[PDB]
Amino acid sequence: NAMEEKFLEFGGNQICLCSWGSPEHPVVLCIHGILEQGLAWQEVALPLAAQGYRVVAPDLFGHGRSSHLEMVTSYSSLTFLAQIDRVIQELPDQPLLLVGHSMGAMLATAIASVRPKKIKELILVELPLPAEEESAVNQLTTCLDYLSSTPQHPIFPDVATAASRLRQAIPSLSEEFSYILAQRITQPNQGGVRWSWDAIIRTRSILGLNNLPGGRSQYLEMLKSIQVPTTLVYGDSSKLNRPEDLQQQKMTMTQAKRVFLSGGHNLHIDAAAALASLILT
Amino acid sequence: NAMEEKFLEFGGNQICLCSWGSPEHPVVLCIHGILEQGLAWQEVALPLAAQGYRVVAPDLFGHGRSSHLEMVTSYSSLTFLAQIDRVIQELPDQPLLLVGHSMGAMLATAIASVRPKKIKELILVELPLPAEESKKESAVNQLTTCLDYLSSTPQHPIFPDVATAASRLRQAIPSLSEEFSYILAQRITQPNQGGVRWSWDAIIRTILGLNNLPGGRSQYLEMLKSIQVPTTLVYGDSSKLNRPEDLQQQKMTMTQAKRVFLSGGHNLHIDAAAALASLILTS
Numbered sequence A: 001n002a003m004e005e006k007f008l009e010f011g012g013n014q015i016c017l018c019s020w021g022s023p024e025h026p027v028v029l030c031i032h033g034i035l036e037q038g039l040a041w042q043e044v045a046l047p048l049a050a051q052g053y054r055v056v057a058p059d060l061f062g063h064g065r066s067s068h069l070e071m072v073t074s075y076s077s078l079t080f081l082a083q084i085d086r087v088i089q090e091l092p093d094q095p096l097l098l099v100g101h102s103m104g105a106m107l108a109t110a111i112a113s114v115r116p117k118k119i120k121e122l123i124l125v126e127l128p129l130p131a132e133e134e135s136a137v138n139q140l141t142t143c144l145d146y147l148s149s150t151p152q153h154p155i156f157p158d159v160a161t162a163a164s165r166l167r168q169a170i171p172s173l174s175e176e177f178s179y180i181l182a183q184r185i186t187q188p189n190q191g192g193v194r195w196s197w198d199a200i201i202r203t204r205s206i207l208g209l210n211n212l213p214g215g216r217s218q219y220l221e222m223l224k225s226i227q228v229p230t231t232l233v234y235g236d237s238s239k240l241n242r243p244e245d246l247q248q249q250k251m252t253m254t255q256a257k258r259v260f261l262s263g264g265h266n267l268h269i270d271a272a273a274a275l276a277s278l279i280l281t
Numbered sequence B: 001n002a003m004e005e006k007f008l009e010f011g012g013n014q015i016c017l018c019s020w021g022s023p024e025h026p027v028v029l030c031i032h033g034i035l036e037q038g039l040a041w042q043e044v045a046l047p048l049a050a051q052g053y054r055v056v057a058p059d060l061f062g063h064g065r066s067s068h069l070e071m072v073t074s075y076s077s078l079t080f081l082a083q084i085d086r087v088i089q090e091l092p093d094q095p096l097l098l099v100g101h102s103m104g105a106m107l108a109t110a111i112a113s114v115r116p117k118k119i120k121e122l123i124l125v126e127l128p129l130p131a132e133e134s135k136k137e138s139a140v141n142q143l144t145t146c147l148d149y150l151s152s153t154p155q156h157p158i159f160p161d162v163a164t165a166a167s168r169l170r171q172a173i174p175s176l177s178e179e180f181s182y183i184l185a186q187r188i189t190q191p192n193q194g195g196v197r198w199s200w201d202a203i204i205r206t207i208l209g210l211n212n213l214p215g216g217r218s219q220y221l222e223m224l225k226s227i228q229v230p231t232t233l234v235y236g237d238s239s240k241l242n243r244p245e246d247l248q249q250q251k252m253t254m255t256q257a258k259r260v261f262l263s264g265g266h267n268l269h270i271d272a273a274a275a276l277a278s279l280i281l282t283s
Helices: A038-050 A077-090 A103-114 A136-147 A159-169 A175-184 A199-207 A215-225 A243-252 A272-280 B038-050 B077-090 B103-114 B139-150 B162-172 B178-187 B217-226 B244-253 B273-281
Strands: A004-010 A013-020 A027-031 A054-058 A096-101 A119-125 A186-189 A192-195 A230-235 A257-261 B004-010 B013-020 B027-031 B054-058 B096-101 B119-125 B189-192 B195-198 B231-236 B258-262
Touching (some): A013 A077, A027 A038, A077 A103, A119 A272, A136 B077, A159 A192, A230 A272, A257 A272, B038 B178, B077 B103, B119 B273, B178 B189, B217 B244, B231 B244
Parallel strands (some): A027 A054, A119 A230, B096 B119, B119 B231
Antiparallel strands (some): A004 A013, B189 B195
């Protein structure tokens, strides 16, 4: 029943893999979104594991218990894609179910476009549309100044404060689950605790984590190119996608099934059971 | 006199700074191209140092004596740009002469666009332009090729001795003296599997998109157009790097740049080293 954790070496760093279920069972590979962690999948993972699946959810670099990258420029969608590809390499050589949430869904789309034989079904939860289109020089200046900044996390009195922060951000989290999440990504410091994920990732837009290595044009190509059965899952009260954004996705991924669940952006929390059932279908 | 090396820590890695001349003298910062090393600037650096300049040539990560990046995806133009920005932050706070060759010239243009107040003169030796790209969809194929490559573990050839490695350098750049070819190979070889291999990172020889920033030909020209610092475009009169249309494009885009043709091919830092030093000295 309980989550297991193991580390896998990659590129001089360590990837923390969270898993639930029997190691001999068919794999559901789940990719979390920005600032989250593999444990965020727990409410989806438990009913899947109960039905005979092995659920595997890596912490992306800089998140959860995975290594922070010592050189800031190593944080890129390309690095996360290589990380996920390495995780797949470590899993059994059978087509698996691939699920991604938000940034995780963008990553999953790229992985499914590159490794179609490995992907039995693709489930894209709250897929974002890339930014549409100022000068590259001014972009580059902002980026280089950001990379040299040395962002720090605030000091909370205790883990309970951190858990309350997570519940403010995702009101459907139980007190228990908010604490289980917060304790895994806090560390003692300066007489209290602070987040233990890499502070540099909090301005993901400037780091380019909102886009794939080839930019928007690579992303739109990918969406239409996906060869594997796919379901687009959205929260019926999410504000991630405007109506025109939903239409852009529907008109690009014309072969994808589309499902709306009861919840906002954070459907892995808001509608965990419904999402697990969807994956089981 | 002789080259000195000083190491600077950055991002958990080590940057080797090759330098010639007195530490208190005005700086000429030189950026080498792909597969080369800071020592490749020596023939330019000696006459500059003799005229009272401090010449500094960093080894780019994965090259020369700088660290290899243990995660392959770390090799990007942005990483090299951040590395060069870090090196500038380490140098005195006085506008300096920035010189780049080939890929190093591309990197030099980007850093000059970002930190113009730091640059007295920008000297661009054999500046490339990105090719006009096809509008055919190849981005899935490109990412596949890239991911497969990133997980490959290419091995360098094993040469029987350093003299053989030096011969390979001299075949690549015929104007290299036997002596200088040997000095370069000496620095970038190491024992392996019964002979010697290159000591730079084998993954760099490639498909990784290392040669250019994100944007394409059009975006890059906009960068070039924006350059406010005094600039000299330097070309080899027998170089085939730039077609006449590419030379024309650079001239049209950078209307305030001075332009000069030196006697030699692409590898002017070797072919025309004294002439290039002379040009730098007159800026």
